[PDB]
Antibody, heavy 223, light 214 residues
């Protein structure tokens, strides 16, 4: 079935250059147009460029025209987008997609996207900090605990609880860009107050950018 | 560049409700508008192409209309799994432009926050900083007012909230305010208080603790 994958995104420094790629299965890109649509973080869907792999014709969005090159190689069934003089404005998730043509110029299949972050900022991984119960009051019924993932660059981090076995009442919030240009997030979990001491709560924090894998055991205190 | 204006910007509609989103073409775009679904953190999906026709595998409770240069997506009987952002698109000229999106969030019975405050861990406090955290768990509507009092004197801009997308099972949102400050200023004050205002609470709940390291 019609599948479209994308790859090679990551942190680029401004003015750098990247090459995202898009590997089409289930169809021959030859007889279709291929489109690169992007989406900045928390904004809408921007079109960047299209290719007709067969006569190779292209069309670009003005924001992009001249700095970016969409090409396609039909023998590899892959299409490519070459980004040059990358501005911070180019930080977006990038989706390729196609126009079936037969019946419609709608964009029926799309890929999963790839995060391209354009920044001057060096990779830094998470310091992981416990958010512990019973800080004034011990009794209640349902207790809450979490882990505070602080100061990492770029996105993402992945928070799990007790190696994926505690999936209930787990709330990992949206990340927040700090004044510092670095991210933070909290992952929280609600549990019974009977179990505190009968059970270990441990969060697992994977920053794949810095190759960080922290495990913190969130356990209680008195004051 | 024909501009697809799209209204509303978001809507609370209840399960079973008929919902209607419009996208007004800024130039006649004929019949060349497709409509898309965006479930959070995911690739766009086609629902309707060239105004009217559903994609294969799109539930018939979805439907598209044309009336000049106004285009309508209708969900007859809104299901709880239609929590998504819908996008409209004129694919008439180049560039293909999109509408600004309409978030459709499910309405349900006004629930109240379970508030929890958390002191700074001293592994952080060592590093010369202090993030005091306030949790507001499983409430609805999304709106709410967290309010940091530090020995009663509430604070200006030094707190930052983040909020959950609404849950899939119980349509509630969760949210956290994180007041962060230097291990120095932190230690000037004794009492650290969070004051939560919401509809689900007749009275503002105040969660607090006395300054740690004890």
């Amino acid at each position: 079935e019609v599948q479209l994958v994308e790859s090679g995104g990551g942190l680029v420094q401004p003015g750098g250059s990247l090459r995202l790629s898009c590997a089409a299965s289930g169809f021959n890109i030859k007889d279709t147009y291929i489109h690169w649509v992007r989406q900045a973080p928390g904004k809408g869907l921007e079109w960047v460029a299209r290719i007709y792999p067969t006569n190779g014709y292209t069309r670009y969005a003005d924001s992009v025209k001249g700095r970016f090159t969409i090409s396609a190689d039909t023998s590899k069934n892959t299409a490519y987008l070459q980004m040059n003089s990358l501005r911070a404005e180019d930080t977006a998730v990038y989706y390729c997609s196609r126009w079936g043509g037969d019946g419609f110029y709608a964009m029926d299949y799309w890929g999963q996207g790839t995060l391209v972050t354009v920044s001057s900022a060096s990779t830094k991984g998470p310091s992981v900090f416990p958010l512990a119960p019973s800080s004034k009051s011990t009794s209640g019924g349902t207790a809450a605990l979490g882990c505070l993932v602080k100061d990492y660059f770029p996105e993402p981090v992945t928070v799990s609880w007790n190696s994926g076995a505690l999936t209930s009442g787990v709330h990992t919030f949206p990340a927040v860009l700090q004044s510092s240009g670095l991210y933070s997030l909290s992952s929280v979990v609600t549990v019974p107050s009977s179990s505190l001491g009968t059970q270990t709560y441990i969060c697992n924090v994977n920053h794949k950018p810095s190759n960080t894998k922290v495990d913190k055991k969130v356990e209680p205190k008195s004051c | 560049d024909i501009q697809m204006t799209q209204s509303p910007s978001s809507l609370s509609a209840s399960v079973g409700d008929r919902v209607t989103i419009t996208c007004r073409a800024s130039q006649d775009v004929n019949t060349a508008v497709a409509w898309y679904q965006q479930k959070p953190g995911k690739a766009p999906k086609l629902l309707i192409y060239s105004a009217s026709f559903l994609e294969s595998g799109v539930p018939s409770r979805f439907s598209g209309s044309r009336s000049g240069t106004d285009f309508t997506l209708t969900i007859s009987s809104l299901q709880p799994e239609d929590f998504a952002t819908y996008y409209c698109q004129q694919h008439y000229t180049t560039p293909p432009t999109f509408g600004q999106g309409t978030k459709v969030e499910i309405k349900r019975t006004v629930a109240a926050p379970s508030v929890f405050i958390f002191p700074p861990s001293d592994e952080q406090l060592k590093s010369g900083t202090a993030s005091v955290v306030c949790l507001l768990n499983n409430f609805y509507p999304r709106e709410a007012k967290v309010q940091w009092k530090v020995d009663n004197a509430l604070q200006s801009g030094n707190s930052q909230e983040s909020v959950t997308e609404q849950d899939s099972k119980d349509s509630t949102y969760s949210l956290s305010s994180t007041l962060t400050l230097s291990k120095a200023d932190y230690e000037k004050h004794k009492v650290y208080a969070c004051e939560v205002t919401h509809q689900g609470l007749s009275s503002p709940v105040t969660k607090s603790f006395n300054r740690g390291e004890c």
